[PDB]
Each structure stands twice: as structure tokens, then as C-alpha cells.
Write a protein that binds this ligand. Structure first.
Ligand SMILES: CCCCCCCCCCCCCCCCCC(=O)O[C@@H](COC(=O)CCCCCCCCCCCCCCC)COP(=O)(O)OCC[N+](C)(C)C
Ligand SMILES: CCCCCCCCCCCCCCCCCC(=O)O[C@@H](COC(=O)CCCCCCCCCCCCCCC)COP(=O)(O)OCC[N+](C)(C)C
Ligand SMILES: CCCCCCCCCCCCCCCCCC(=O)O[C@@H](COC(=O)CCCCCCCCCCCCCCC)COP(=O)(O)OCC[N+](C)(C)C
Ligand SMILES: CCCCCCCCCCCCCCCCCC(=O)N[C@@H](COP(=O)(O)OCC[N+](C)(C)C)[C@H](C)O
Ligand SMILES: CCCCCCCCCCCCCCCCCC(=O)N[C@@H](COP(=O)(O)OCC[N+](C)(C)C)[C@H](C)O
Ligand SMILES: CCCCCCCCCCCCCCCCCC(=O)N[C@@H](COP(=O)(O)OCC[N+](C)(C)C)[C@H](C)O
Ligand SMILES: *[C@@H]1O[C@H](CO)[C@@H](O)[C@H](O)[C@H]1NC(C)=O
Ligand SMILES: *[C@@H]1O[C@H](CO)[C@@H](O)[C@H](O)[C@H]1NC(C)=O
Ligand SMILES: *[C@@H]1O[C@H](CO)[C@@H](O)[C@H](O)[C@H]1NC(C)=O
Ligand SMILES: *[C@@H]1O[C@H](CO)[C@@H](O)[C@H](O)[C@H]1NC(C)=O
Ligand SMILES: *[C@@H]1O[C@H](CO)[C@@H](O)[C@H](O)[C@H]1NC(C)=O
Lengths: 496, 75, 75, 495, 495, 75
């Protein structure tokens, strides 16, 4: 439910609603003017009632092998086991003569039939769209210590968090947040997991979300959901050297390892009784018109604070720390700010824990405070006068470097989510919808022309396109080739 | 993997079929045909580019064939 | 065989590692590199044919790269 | 030891002859004033193979543990990293105040899993000293249909011999009774290039494989008489880190993947020694001391009948089995091929040189093979009122015959390479110089196009024909057209 | 905590000043109507050190074994190659019938030796939150010669204070008795760049080393809390193979070679915590609550004498010690600097502002130090019969002082880089613009020439000067000349 | 460790002498001095090739200096 200590999180600035895209293992932190800071993340997604679409055989056996032989110029042999469904039959030809038992010399036809049996099969099932089940966690930052910030039970007992279920049947629900009010989400589970480009393939105890086209093109003997008769069985059989009376047929070895090699790139999932995975995306709209500030009339804390846990960097240009309060004043606001210098104490930066405060009235209360300082030097100041305590902090980067990092992150978000990327952190407008639509048409024209390519092929194609465009003419084909080459190289490098 | 590392034609003189000779024609071609028929739009890319960077019909066809063969391999 | 039918990059968002992402570079290259190291003499003929086919050095380089890629793939 | 009913059959015509015995083939030699010889290589055998390397294709995992360090504790160390049978991998996980760290970021984990090989494929090597060739030699004396392929009977009649050619016994001389002696001297060290092959054993299947392919196999491997496995990580998959326990799984059995990779390798039999039916052996057949019987028996005058009617063997020859009702004794059989019944002059060639009834018992059966000419002819048995005339038609022509032998010679050059010039060779200068040209040119060819498959051979050849058709120097054009034609022939001839 | 007796010293004049507390320096601030202030950094200290790596520089070889195979059997495998503490190497050696082989040629051997580390150099990491700077503040009140430097007496007079500055306590206010309060706000996270250094302990010696250099040593190394050594064969030499025993020796101790590689590193003391005396710390001294003492007492009425004759310091100042014979309690000393004995106008500012006797007993020694103008002047104490004069000559000139100030600022820019623009800063705009344009052209310069040494820097500077004077475009010529001048200045400043 | 990997000047602001600063002017030039002393023929041949490679006189001088510096450093 909570994103503190998560290696990848997005910050959104709030105008009563904002539509977000919750990715698999990621979180979004939303700050709005005069609003509690919230964070929302898709914890997992689920599928409950799957039906088999196709079984492939990857370990098969031969049971009894028969050969029917014809003398030369007598025509085809036609082993009589071709009338039985479980027998695989192949026609060959062998040397025949007086020594063998023929009245003639030459190539005599033989027909060999071997009884096919499947020992081990991989089962592919489909997901019905109505059975998808997203788990979503929401958390109001509120007043927490470091040991209860990630504890869901504590945050639920404080009415500051909630994990709930998003279903196509019930795509929108609201969570009560105690004195913070209510927080609503309306999602699009149908537009989330595609559910029509995927199968769930179970091989042994391993389960994979796989593309439908790859699964249907698999070169193994296959059958129908309840069928016991197999097609393309000759894939798993080797007919040995023809012999006038005994051609031998050998089953190949188990193809389980070959199947695992072929599955390279499929998404592992858990299928104990229902498919669970943490790798999709879900577009939602967070509505916060009923979200209110809590403790607007507490008043500032009067005693001295101490750094219980020293300021630590979270890796997202933000700083977290934990204060301890010597006072027993009660619920009071914490006078913490970020200043440029200890003279000219005007606040700068931005609190992420908006309106930090002490929750209870007993002493030695610990409060987790998390804020975003500016680039360069700053001071975390809490208290005034003789009780004031200061902490010197330095943020390493720069504004332009951060802008470049945000640009490349947005580019790779476009590369991942495609069109839903414009839905990410938007508030509508003629810009986002037009940009989304032109992205849709260009994405169609790009997937129909360069889809189904690995990183190496698209990198080489981008190199060729850059070369030709630099050497092109008309300044209009050249721009198209330059753009396509650049996008292809970016995609090739984006998987490394 | 290892099945990608396929043993070639044996150097022994063999008036007999090798280990998997039924698939001898289809081993090197299944991936190309499957990828081509699942990605029909790449064919136009191949023809167009090969017609561009060439200078005459002699090497345009070679470019088209080479591009149509290189991309199904390496996926 | 099925080993050449690699699933490839998944279509989800997937801010995680796929099934065999440790081989994401081992794939698509290992067969080619082993073939080239064990067939050094093919590189010479491929280079010289690429030189002879290409009208200009830009075409010659592309021919050379395409010849060095196709033969290891389909061999 | 003899070839009646074999599809691969060769016919050869100053006093010795150089032959190449191919694995599933036979050679029939009809010299000027000698009985007909059948020579073949039945089998190659290697007795004492030494293990070189084992590849694991099925492994298991039994004990997975993980150790973690906070983002400022350095690399993680797992105790099992100091044990042999454990594979360990260092990964990176997200760490923060929730887990228990004092800092945020990428903490370091180390995961170790116990590795155990369940099923492995064993490679072995052959010393050239241990290669045995089984060679059969046969003289077309008097045989019946059932006796013709029975070595015991043909040995008791001094008409056949089976012997072993080794480096320590490269030459043999076999006694052929009143036909004399026939010698062979072979070159076993040049036959089976043991320094180019290994014997792979996967389960109960055994293959002759190239050493370069075997060395490049991407599997965990161990040395002979060792349990220390190397490159084990190929068979293992470490899933997503968890910072307290990261799962490790073993990939499935690679037996089927190995079988797919073994496509093109040569299946062999290995119970105690590797038995093999392919390959070739260059020998020289010496017929100086081999002669015709030196006496003729006198005509069989009683009645003849066809125990087995004339049958086409498939190699432009007709075979039949006569039954003789007489009981007088050993007698010469009156039998011939004639153009017409008016002119009884023999016209063909006799594979059974001087057919005769060998025994004095009534109803003797004698197998006779003949090479009639193209078109219509008559098999005539007996004289006068006992004469049996059997009309025989032989389809084809000498022009088509020459064309087919040219194609077969080209395929023999492709399959054998250099010893193709040693096939039917009598030591001529042209054969020697052509052999040397084949040495140099084929060496260059294998240097440039050695590792290519048939499809890439065909594409490369098509490119070479296109380039030679539009060439300019007219000399480079010639050589490029030649190599393109060779590549097309190699591409097409494999199907 | 005093500037007196220190060869490195600087003088500075709304009511706050930006200073840089260099490691072995001292700063004297002389504001308009404030007591003179001495501020200096005394010692940096890092408290809790975490190991990051251990390098081996003394190894041991214990048990060597070799296993050999016949020239074509295959690569040998020692049974010890599985065990963790064994370094194993594969060699090749002559073999034949005299060695027990059935063949001839290069057989394979595998040699294993037991590796053991005896002595280890440990690298440790500093967390910025564990760095604390000791800072000394002193007010030029009334001191004697012996007590001017004794903290136990200056603190007892409320004239000095030693305080610790950490990231969690970056600002300190210290009371100074009758002078009020002096406060300081610093930037401890910018002082010692702990992200770029490790603490390397070898034997009993400890060094502050660059992280890249430490990570680039070619020695066997482990992770913290592990004995799994790697790159062990760096310290091992395998002798000539013999197929029955190959000798392995351990290379000698690398402690001395490590000391030689450590050239240029900064020695530190690490008995319990890491203590350093180099470095710098940027601070802001706030003197608004700093006031001149409210002194009710009058001037001293009795006779003075030079208890210690005036002495020249290294920084254009004169220090003397007066002996007061009177006993009329605390009183002001009528001491001044005059150009001549006829014009008694005080012309030279005094560093010991408002000097006075502090005690009431007789024979009191007072240290007075002051800055006379260039040329001749007189230190005058008293008037009339009690007046004592001392002739002082201060060699130098304003132009020379300005030139020396410029070169010292050049060395400051070299040593500190960008913080050099914050030295003696009262805010301003030229300082900020200069610092901004030094942040660039200071990172690019250390990208093109960061890793050079002084000899490489000098050679490159000479080359750049030659190219610039030989250039044509004046812009590129000027930039080449500027970078060459900078490089030559840096090559020269190290000596 | 390997003594050629000298730590060099620290970027820490330091007015004392670092470890082994008695050899700053000797640890970079001692190897080169003995070597020119023990190999004057290389000095001669370096002068010759430096003169021969330089179209201009300053180019000749730069070539001679570079040739005189490179060889002693790489044994
Ligand atoms: C001198 C300037 C030249 C500089 C060239 C350098 C190269 C720059 C390259 C910039 C690209 C940066 C990367 C942006 C991210 C895009 C990645 C991506 O995903 O690819 C797009 C790339 O989009 C395109 O199609 C771009 C096509 C480029 C060619 C268009 C050129 C414009 C021609 C217009 C001419 C107008 C007429 C002339 C009037 C002036 C399509 O894939 P999606 O559908 O988004 O895939 C998402 C995943 N999923 C499908 C699973 C949901
Ligand atoms: C005007 C137009 C002229 C057209 C030219 C026509 C070219 C004719 C050739 C094509 C027809 C088919 C020929 C196929 C014959 C079968 C060859 C064969 O068996 O393949 C060889 C391939 O070897 C060759 O024959 C090498 C190719 C040589 C090509 C000759 C080119 C010469 C051109 C010279 C032109 C310049 C002359 C200079 C003076 C002006 C395999 O044996 P090796 O490589 O020796 O050994 C390995 C074999 N094994 C594994 C089975 C043991
Ligand atoms: C006609 C005019 C002729 C011009 C003659 C110029 C000659 C000047 C020669 C310089 C001699 C004195 C040098 C004193 C300056 C020392 C400053 C210094 O060394 O700073 C840097 C080195 O200097 C630089 O980095 C800057 C060098 C840039 C030089 C090029 C400037 C380009 C000028 C462009 C001119 C434009 C012309 C416009 C007219 C058309 C040292 O390391 P830092 O990276 O700064 O800090 C490291 C220390 N610490 C660990 C504590 C952080
Ligand atoms: C005369 C007119 C012609 C000249 C005008 C030329 C300018 C127009 C061409 C623009 C080409 C840019 C292509 C690069 C893609 C990077 C985009 C990116 O990085 N996206 C955003 C990051 O936003 P998020 O990822 O947080 O999601 C926001 C969702 N969103 C994608 C709708 C913004 C950045 C800040 O931009
Ligand atoms: C200007 C217009 C265009 C001109 C076109 C000219 C045509 C060129 C192509 C002609 C190719 C002919 C066939 C050459 C291949 C060799 C086949 C061969 O040698 N065949 C042999 C039977 O081989 P054997 O193995 O039985 O023994 C013989 C052993 N030895 C031949 C190796 C020495 C005979 C001659 O048939
Ligand atoms: C046509 C009209 C033009 C004709 C005339 C042209 C000639 C121009 C001559 C250039 C005059 C330059 C002035 C010389 C002194 C400037 C400053 C100086 O020298 N001071 C020093 C003192 O350094 P600090 O350690 O005190 O640094 C403390 C803080 N700080 C780093 C900011 C200084 C430094 C080197 O700056
Ligand atoms: C043939 O195979 C089928 C399928 O496994 C099996 O049910 C049947 O018993 C087998 N019959 C024989 C005779 O092997
Ligand atoms: C680990 O594997 C080995 C074989 O590789 C086995 O003998 C042992 O019992 C396994 N378990 C351990 C060491 O706990
Ligand atoms: C050869 O003939 C003998 C004589 O009866 C017979 O015993 C033997 O089985 C025959 N050989 C074969 C292979 O049957
Ligand atoms: C090998 O060295 C290790 C220490 O690295 C030691 O514990 C072990 O006893 C040694 N083995 C011997 C000497 O056989
Ligand atoms: C400072 O003066 C006191 C007073 O007696 C003395 O005990 C102490 O040793 C002195 N300190 C130093 C460092 O001289």
C-alpha cells in the first residue's frame, strides 16, 4: 500500500481528480495544494477461473512398433494400424531381393506404425476478462513512526491506509480515511491486462504469461482441452533405418528444457489456485474532492525535538527522517522546514509529509517526516530559539539534469505503456487527447511495420535508417527515416 | 540454448540417413517462414529499403533477399 | 525445433526481469559468434563479395554486415 | 561378403586395382582373364574408447539459501559459497527502513543452491590403433540362391573370405581354392578420421559427432572420473530477489534439446565396442595369383529348368537360378545371351564367368548373373530340344548409362573428396595429377565454405552465379562461376 | 585554537563573514567595532567505520599436488579443484614412453596449492553523518605569553571555545563572557567528501585513499566478513611443469610495494576513530551578538616595560609582551603605533584591540600584538617620564603585499576550487558569479586533465602554449594559452 | 600491490606532505633516466625518426620528445 523504500516511484502534483497509471511494481505519490499527500500502487493482479485452450506434448513414449513390408513393384504396404488413432504411421522403402524373400530385386515399400503416448504435457489456458482482479493499496501519509509506516495493520487502525479490489464488475470504490475524509478511485480493469493477447502456460510447476501467437505457433504435438488424441506427433518420434521386417522407432527425449528455453521472455506467474502476477498496468482516476486536512487547529509543538533516525536519502531526490518529541503537549504541529541558510529562514523545497504533526499525547513520540529539498545545500530546521535543531543536507544533482532524467523516464514510459502513457498524471485537455491519438496512429503504423523484432534487429534497422536518412534527399523522407531510426535505437537500448 | 547449436552434415561418407533427416529441410526454414507470415508488414519495409539503398535491379534484389533473411533470424 | 521459437520480449509493462533475461544478450548472438570463430575463412570471402557488390563504401559496408550475419544464422 | 540385392553396387573392369570400400556399398570387379570378384566393407569396429568429457543434461536443486546486506554493508557472502556442490549468485534488492536497514537503495544478496546432476551425456574418443574394418571378399564360383549369401558355405567352398583390417594388419591374402589367391593391402589410418570425431552416449543412444561441435556444447560439464561440475549456471534459473529468500529452479531435462542438436550426427551401436556401418576404406586388390580354374568340365547334356526365373537386379544385370535334373557330375552349363535365336553368338558379359554344376547330385541349383546389352536379347539355356529361350528386354541406352555414371561419379567426388580419384584407379598419371588438384582446390573450398549448410550454400552459389554472369575480368568470372556451380551441386545433391 | 605561532594565517575584515576553515590554517577576523576573532579547524574525526574490502599482500602456499594425463587422454582434473581454499592451474608438459605414456607429445597437468592469507589491508567507508569537525574560536582579550595558547586558561576567562560540528549540529553559538555571543553555521557535508575516499589500514599505518585507486589494486581481495579470496593467483607463481610435481611458490610480501603504491595518500590516525588534520570546512561566522567589552576602568597609570621584546611574525604583524609594574587593578594600556615621536597620532591598527591589564597584582604580563604600516614606525607606551618607545621597521610595500596576496589566492583556488570563492565573502554578486563560472570550466578541466600528474601536466601545458602561440584564430589560441597556463601553474605549484 | 599504480596527488586540501612526497620528482622520472643512460642508441634513433617524421621544425621537436618519452616508460 505504501511506497517508501521502493526503487521506482512517481511524483504527481495536483483540479479535484487526477488520472494515474499504476504499474506492476511501482507507486505514485500525489501532492496537491492544501491536501494530504497520498500514495497509491497496484500491489498485484489476479485471475480466478481459467479454462484450458490447448495442451502440447513435450514428453512422449512409443509402445509397440509394427512394420508391414511389400515386395518391389507390389505397391504401398499400408500397415493396418493406420485405422487406429493412437498409432503414428510412416511409409518408407527398403532394399529387397532373393535373400530377403522377394521374387524381385529393388526398393520394396514398408509401413511402420508405433503407438504414441503422451507422458508429460504443457497446458495453455485463457483468461476471461470478467475474472481479472486487481489489488490496489492507498495510503494517506498522516502521522507515522518508522516502525509502523509500512505496517498495514497499524495504518488501517489509524484509518490512513486501505487495500481493496478493483474488478470489471465494480471498477470504482471509495475508502474512508477517518478525519481525512474519503478517497475515491474509478479504474478501467478492462483496459488493463489485455487478456486477449495472452495465455497462461503451465509446464510442470512453472507458469508463464505468454503471447497467444507464440503459443499457437509452438512446434510440438498438441491436442484439444479434453481430447486424448494428438496431432503432429511425428515431431517427437524418430523413425530409424528402414529394415525389411523391423524398422525401429524411438521417442525423442523430454522437451521440457527446450520448452523452457523457448519461453525466454515470458512473464513468470504463480498459479497455486488462481493466476497472480505483479507486472501489469491499471489506469485509474483518483478523486479527492472529499479528502480534507486533519488537525487544522492543533497548534505548534512547544518542546524540543530530536533526530531519532538521522536524515536518509530515498533515491528519488527526497529525504526522510524520524523525530522524537520530548513534550507531552498532545496532538501538535511539528515546526519543521527546509531553509536555504540558517540566516534567512524563509522555507524552501516542499514537505512530502504534508502538515507533519505529533499524533498522541504521551512523551517520546516518534514521527516520520519526509520532504523534498532543492538541489544544492539546505538545512532541515525544526524548533525555534534555544530548542531549534538543524541538520545540514546536500542534494547532488541539478535542475537541468533532473529535467533530462524526467525526459528519458517519460520516453521509456511511452515505450512501455504506449498510449496509456498520456493518461498518466493528466487532468485532461486538448493537448493530451490529441497527443494520445497521434501516438495511437503512429503506434499502429510502427507496430505493423517493425513489430515482432528483437533488440538486435531493431538496432541494426535503426543504424541503417540513420545512414540512409543522413544520405537521403527531399528532407521529408529523411526526417521520417531519422525519426524511425532514432526510435528503433532507443527501443534497442531500453532493454539494457 | 543448445538446439540452436545444431550438428551439421557429418563428414563421414554415409549412404544412409543421419540422425534427424526428416527435418533436414525444415530445421533452417521454420523460423523464417513463421516470422514472415506473422509479420507481413516487415516485407514492405524490406522491399522498400532494398530498392532505396541499391543502385540497380542487380543489387536491389540481393538487398531485399538479405534483409528478408536477416530479420527473421535474430528475431 | 522449439528452441529457435523464443517467446521474445513480453508485451506487458513488466518493471521486472522476464523468464531468462540473463540470456537476453546470450541469445541471438552465441550461434553467430561461435560459427564465426570456427569459420574464420568465411569472413574473408564475405568481405570481398561485399566489396565487389557495393557500388559505394556505404553499400559495401552494408553488404559485408549482411553477409556476415546471414550465413552463421542459416548454417 | 557378396552383393546380390544391394542397391549400392559398383562395377570395375595393370594387374591390381585401387578401390574405395564404402560402408553400405559393394564393388564388382571383372578383370580381363580373371573370375569375377565381389568386395565390400561390412562393418567398422572400435574396441577401447576413452572418456573425454561428460555433459549434464538433467540436474536438480535441493537446498537454496540467501544472505543479505544493507546498502552500506558491502557484497553479501553466503557460507555455502565455500562448498563444492553449491552454485552461488550475487544479486541486488531494494532495501530501506521497512526491511530494517539504516539507509535506502540497493542492498546486496547472495543466493546459494545445491547442484546435483541426474542425467549426463558421456563423450568418448577412439584411438586409431583400435579401429577394425570387417571386409568381405567373394569369388563368383558355383552357388545356389540360398547358398549365395551363406558365409559358412562359401567359406567351405573356398569362394569367400571375411577378414579384419587393422593398422597392425593392413594386408591379407585369402585362399580361393582352384582360383588361386587374392590379396588386399589397405590403409586403415586413412579410413576413419578418428581425430575428427567423438562418440556421444546419451542414455541408450550413441552418435558419432564432430569434436568441434562437441567442444562448443553449452551444458554443465565434468572431466572423466570427476564429480566437479563446471558451468552449472546454464541449468539454473534465479528468479526475482526477495532479500530474505530468492528462489532457484532447475531447468527441465535437456535430453530432447540435445537430440535436436544432434541432428546430422551419425547413429552408431556401442555395447562394448562402437560398431559403425558408414565410412570408407581405401584398399588395393591384387589379383596376380588369382586365376580361372584352368580346366573345363564338359557340357551338361540333361534337361534344365528355371528354379528362379530371370530377375532384374537393378544394376543393368539379370540374375536367374537354374535347376539341373542330371546326375552325371560336375559339368559346364550351356547358357548365354544372344541377339536372336538364328545367331547364337554370345553378346553380353557374364558376371558368373563360367557357370557350372558343382555337384554330382540330381536337381542341383546354380545361380547365374549376366549383363545383357540394351534392348532385346534372349537368355538361352541348353541346346536342341532341351533349349529354353527366355526373351529379355533391358531398358535404357548407353548414352543415358554414361550420363548416370557421370552423375554418380560427381556424387562420389562430393562424398569422398580426394579418395574418389583412388576408386578404380590403376595408377595413371591423370588420376594422380587430378588428385593433387583436388587436394589443393578442395582444401581452399573447405577453408572458405567449410561450415556452411545446404541452404546457405545454395544462396551463396546463386550469388556467385549472379556475380560471375555480370563480371568484367572474364578470369575471376570463370572461377566464380565454377565455385557457384559446385555450391549449387552440393546444395541440390543433399536432397 | 590560536593564530599565534602558525605559519598559515589569513586576515579578514552585514555582520557575518564567510570563511573556509582549512586544515592547518588559522583565520583572524578584524571587524569594524568587534573584538578580534581567531577561528580555526583543529581535527576532523570519523567515528563508525564499515569495512568494504580486504586485500591480501602476504600469502602462504601449503600443500601442492599435480595430476597428469597422457598426451591425448584429455585435460587433467585435480580432485582439489573443487575445494574452495585451493588455487589450481592447468599446464602442459612433454610426455612419452619414458614418462609412462603410450603416446608422445604435450600432455596436460593440473596443479593445486593451498592458498592462505597471512596479512591483510582493510578498506573502510565513512558515512557523512559520522564526521565531526573540531573548531576553535578565540577572542583577543587579555592574555600573557604562556597563557595565549592554553585552552584551560582561555576557556576560564571566557575568551575561547572548542566545539564539535556535525551534520546534525551544523550551527553552534558559544558564549564569550563580556564579549557577548559568537555564532557559526557551517556545511559539514561539503567539508570532507566521504563519497570519494576510503580508509585503508595496512599494518599499523592508515591512509585516506581515493576510491577508484583502492578498487583498482591488483591483489587478492575478499568481501567484508568473508574468507573467500579471489584473484589469488596474483600472489602465486607456478614453476616449470614436470608431470609428476610442479612447484608453486608464494610471491614475497607486498607490504612495501603497497607502501610505494600509496604515495600521495594522506596518513591518518585510526587508534579508535579516524582522526585527520587536513581538509577544509566552509563556515559562516555571525558576530552581531559579539560586542566590545564594557570597561569601566581607566588607563594604567604606572610604568611599563618590554617583558618580551617585539617579535615579527610571518604575516606583517608584531607581537610583544608588556610588563606592568603597577597594581591598580584592571586598566587600559596606553600603547599605540606612531610614524614619529613628534606626531603621536595612532596610525597602525592593533590586532589585540583595546589591550588591558586583567589582574590586580603587580608585575603583570600582557601580550599585545598589532599591525604596523610599511616602513619605520614606533611602538609607544605611556607618556612623559613613563613613556617607552620601540623602533620597528616593517619591510615590504603595498604593491608587493598585493602581489603575494594574488599568488596566495591562486594557491587557494588550486587547493579548494569552488569553496575558494566563499573565502572572505560577505555575499556579493561577483563572488557568486565567479563561483558559478568556476563550477563549469572546473569540471570540464578536470574531465580533460583530471587524472594527470605534475610532469604530465607540465608537458601538456608546454604543448598547449606552443599550439596557442602557433594558432591562427585568436579565440582558440587564447583558450589554449589559458589552459596551458593553468596546467603549468598546477605543475609548478606542487613544488 | 602493484607499485606502478601509485595513488598520486589527493584532491583533499592538504598543506602537509602526503605519504612519500620526498619522491614526487623522482618516482615519475627515475625509470626514464637510467634507461636513456643505458641506451643512448635509442636517443640517437629517436632523434633521427623525430626529425624525419616532422614536416615542420616544431613538429620534429614534438616527435623527438614523444619518442624519447614513450620507449623508457614501456621498458
Ligand atoms: C536533426 C534531427 C534528427 C534527430 C534524429 C535522432 C533520433 C531521435 C529519436 C527520438 C525517439 C525517442 C524515443 C521516444 C519513445 C518512443 C518509443 C516507442 O514506443 O516507439 C513508438 C515510436 O512512435 C512512432 O511510431 C514514431 C515514428 C517515427 C517516424 C515519424 C516521423 C514524422 C514524419 C512526419 C512528416 C510530416 C510531413 C512533413 C511536414 C513538415 C511506437 O511504439 P509504441 O506503440 O509507443 O510502443 C508502446 C508499447 N506498446 C505497444 C506495448 C503499448
Ligand atoms: C563460361 C562459363 C563457365 C561455367 C563454369 C562451370 C563450373 C563447373 C562446376 C559446376 C558443376 C558441378 C560440379 C560438382 C562436382 C562435385 C564436386 C565435389 O564433390 O565437391 C567437392 C568440393 O571441392 C571442389 O571441387 C572445390 C571447388 C573448386 C572449383 C574450381 C574453380 C576453378 C576456377 C578457375 C578459373 C580461373 C583459371 C585461371 C586461368 C585463366 C567436395 O570435395 P572436397 O571439398 O575436395 O573435400 C570434402 C568432401 N567430403 C567432405 C565429401 C570428403
Ligand atoms: C591576451 C590574454 C592572455 C591570457 C593569459 C592567461 C594566462 C593565465 C595562466 C594561469 C596562471 C594562474 C592560474 C591560477 C588559477 C588556478 C585555479 C585552478 O587551478 O582551478 C582548478 C583548475 O582550473 C580550472 O578548472 C579552470 C581552467 C579553465 C581554463 C580555460 C578558461 C577559458 C577562457 C576562455 C577565454 C575566452 C576569450 C574571449 C575573447 C574572445 C583547480 O582544480 P579545481 O577543479 O578548480 O578544484 C579542485 C580542488 N578541490 C579538490 C578543492 C575541489
Ligand atoms: C514549428 C514547430 C515545430 C518544432 C517543435 C518541436 C517540438 C515537438 C517535438 C517533440 C518530440 C519529443 C519526443 C521525445 C519524447 C519524450 C517525452 C517525455 O519524456 N515525456 C515527458 C515526461 O512526462 P511523464 O513521463 O511524467 O508523463 C507525461 C505523459 N506525456 C508523454 C503525455 C508527456 C517529458 C517531460 O516531455
Ligand atoms: C561453352 C558452352 C558451355 C560448356 C559446358 C561444359 C560442361 C561442363 C561440365 C561437365 C562436367 C562433367 C562431369 C565432371 C565431374 C566428374 C565426374 C566423373 O569423374 N565421372 C567419371 C566416373 O567417376 P567414378 O567415380 O565412377 O570413377 C572416376 C574417378 N574420377 C573421375 C574421380 C577420376 C566418368 C568420367 O563419368
Ligand atoms: C583599457 C583598460 C584596461 C587596461 C588595464 C587592464 C589590466 C587588468 C589587470 C587585472 C587586475 C586584476 C585584479 C588583481 C587582484 C584581484 C583579486 C586578487 O588579486 N585577490 C586574490 C585574493 O585571494 P583570496 O585568497 O583573498 O580569496 C578570497 C576570495 N576570492 C577568491 C574571491 C578572492 C585572488 C587571487 O583574487
Ligand atoms: C497404445 O497407446 C494408448 C495411449 O497411451 C494406450 O492407451 C494403449 O493401451 C496402447 N496400446 C498398446 C497395445 O500399446
Ligand atoms: C548437496 O548435493 C550433494 C550432491 O551434489 C549431495 O551429496 C548432498 O547430500 C546435498 N545436500 C547437502 C550437502 O546438504
Ligand atoms: C548356412 O548353411 C548351414 C547348413 O545347414 C546352416 O546351418 C546355416 O544356418 C546357414 N547360414 C545361415 C546364416 O543361416
Ligand atoms: C588450507 O588452508 C586453509 C586456510 O586457507 C586451512 O584452514 C586448511 O587447514 C589448509 N589445508 C591443509 C593445510 O591441508
Ligand atoms: C594551562 O594552565 C594550567 C594552570 O596551571 C596548567 O595546569 C596546564 O598544564 C596548562 N596547560 C598547558 C597545555 O600548558
Amino acid at each position: 500500500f505504501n511506497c517508501l523504500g521502493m526503487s521506482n516511484r512517481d511524483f504527481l502534483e495536483g483540479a479535484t481528480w487526477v488520472d494515474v497509471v499504476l504499474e506492476g511494481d511501482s507507486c505514485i505519490t500525489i501532492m496537491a495544494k492544501d491536501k494530504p499527500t497520498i500514495d497509491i500502487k497496484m500491489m498485484e493482479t489476479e485471475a480466478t477461473n481459467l479454462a484450458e485452450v490447448r495442451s502440447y506434448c513435450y514428453l512422449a513414449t512409443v509402445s509397440d512398433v509394427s512394420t508391414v513390408s511389400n515386395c518391389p513393384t507390389t505397391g504401398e504396404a499400408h500397415n493396418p494400424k493406420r485405422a487406429e488413432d493412437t498409432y503414428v504411421c510412416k511409409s518408407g522403402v527398403t532394399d529387397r531381393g532373393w535373400g530377403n524373400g522377394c521374387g524381385l530385386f529393388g526398393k520394396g515399400s514398408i509401413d511402420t506404425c508405433a503407438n504414441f503416448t503422451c507422458s508429460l504435457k504443457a497446458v495453455g489456458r485463457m483468461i476471461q476478462p470478467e475474472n481479472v482482479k486487481y489489488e490496489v493499496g492507498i495510503f494517506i501519509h498522516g502521522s507515522t513512526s518508522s516502525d509502523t509506516h509500512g505496517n498495514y495493520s497499524s495504518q488501517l487502525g489509524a484509518s490512513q491506509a486501505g487495500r481493496f479490489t478493483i474488478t470489471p464488475n465494480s471498477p470504482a470504490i471509495t475508502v474512508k480515511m477517518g478525519d481525512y475524509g474519503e478517497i475515491s478511485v474509478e479504474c478501467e480493469p478492462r483496459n488493463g491486462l489485455n487478456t486477449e493477447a495472452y495465455y497462461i502456460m503451465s509446464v510442470g510447476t512453472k507458469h508463464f504469461l505468454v503471447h497467444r501467437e507464440w503459443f499457437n505457433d509452438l512446434a510440438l504435438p498438441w491436442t484439444s482441452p479434453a481430447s486424448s488424441n494428438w496431432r503432429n506427433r511425428e515431431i517427437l518420434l524418430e523413425f530409424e533405418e528402414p529394415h525389411a521386417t523391423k524398422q525401429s522407432v524411438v521417442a525423442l527425449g523430454s522437451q521440457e528444457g527446450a520448452l523452457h528455453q523457448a519461453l525466454a521472455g515470458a512473464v513468470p506467474v504463480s498459479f497455486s489456485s488462481s493466476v497472480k502476477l505483479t507486472s501489469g498496468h491499471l489506469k485509474c482516476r483518483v478523486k479527492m474532492e472529499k479528502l480534507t486536512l486533519k488537525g487544522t487547529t492543533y497548534g505548534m509543538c512547544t518542546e524540543k525535538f530530536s533526530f531519532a533516525k538521522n536524515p536518509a536519502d530515498t533515491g528519488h531526490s527526497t529525504v526522510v527522517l524520524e523525530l522524537q518529541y520530548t513534550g507531552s503537549d498532545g496532538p501538535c504541529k511539528i515546526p519543521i522546514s527546509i531553509v536555504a541558510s540558517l540566516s534567512d529562514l524563509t522555507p524552501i523545497g516542499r514537505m512530502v509529509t504534508a502538515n507533519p504533526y505529533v499524533a498522541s499525547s504521551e512523551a517520546n513520540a516518534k514521527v516520520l517526516v519526509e520532504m523534498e529539498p532543492p538541489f544544492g545545500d539546505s538545512y532541515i530546521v525544526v524548533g525555534r530559539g534555544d530548542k531549534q535543531i538543524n541538520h545540514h543536507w546536500h542534494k547532488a544533482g541539478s535542475s537541468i539534469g533532473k529535467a533530462f532524467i524526467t525526459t528519458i523516464k517519460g520516453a521509456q514510459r511511452l515505450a512501455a505503456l504506449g498510449d496509456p502513457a498520456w493518461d498518466f498524471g493528466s487532468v485532461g485537455g486538448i493537448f493530451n487527447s490529441v497527443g494520445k491519438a497521434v501516438h495511437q496512429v503512429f503506434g499502429g503504423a510502427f507496430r505493423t511495420l517493425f513489430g515482432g523484432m528483437s533488440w538486435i534487429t531493431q538496432g541494426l534497422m535503426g543504424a541503417l535508417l540513420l545512414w540512409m536518412g543522413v544520405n537521403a534527399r527531399d528532407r521529408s523522407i529523411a526526417l521520417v527515416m531519422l525519426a524511425t531510426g532514432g526510435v528503433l535505437l532507443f527501443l534497442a537500448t531500453s532493454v539494457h | 540454448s543448445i538446439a540452436v547449436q545444431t550438428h551439421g552434415e557429418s563428414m563421414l561418407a554415409n549412404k544412409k540417413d543421419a540422425w534427424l533427416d526428416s527435418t533436414k529441410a525444415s530445421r533452417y526454414l521454420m523460423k523464417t517462414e513463421n516470422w514472415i507470415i506473422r509479420n507481413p508488414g516487415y516485407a514492405f519495409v524490406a522491399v522498400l529499403l532494398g530498392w532505396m539503398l541499391g543502385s540497380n535491379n542487380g543489387q536491389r534484389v540481393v538487398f531485399v533477399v538479405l534483409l528478408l533473411l536477416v530479420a527473421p533470424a535474430y528475431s
